Amino acid sequence: PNTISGSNNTVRSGSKNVLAGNDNTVISGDNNSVSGSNNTVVSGNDNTVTGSNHVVSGTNHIVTDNNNNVSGNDNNVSGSFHTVSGGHNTVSGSNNTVSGSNHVVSGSNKVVTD
Secondary structure, three states: OOEEEEEOOEEEEOOOOEEEEEOOEEEEOOOOEEEEEOOEEEEEEOOEEEEEOOEEEEEOOEEOOEOOEEOOEOOEEOOEOOEEOOEOOEEOOEOOEEOOEOOEEOOEOOEEOO
16 A cells, blocks of 8 residues: 555555655655655655655645755745745745745745745
8 A cells, every 4th residue: 555665664544655765654644755764744645755854744745855844735845944834835945934825935044924
């Protein structure tokens, strides 16, 4: 039902997830692809999550690098230590806080909302 390769990866509830690496978890969700170390999809579907220490909920995100906290729908997040919600945001750099929709945010320490 799920495809799992590595050490200490788990899916509590859901199907068709693909988890590779170590200590990755899908709490509740389907069709997520998660690769790396210590990443977590809490409640979400169809997310692509690569790198380390991400926490992701919602749908259709692409999250990479490290330590990003992402919820909502269709956010594309790179760099580190971001907090992103809402929809269709594109976030790079470090330590940005982004909510609302359709924002493209780069650099560091930015706060952007609807």
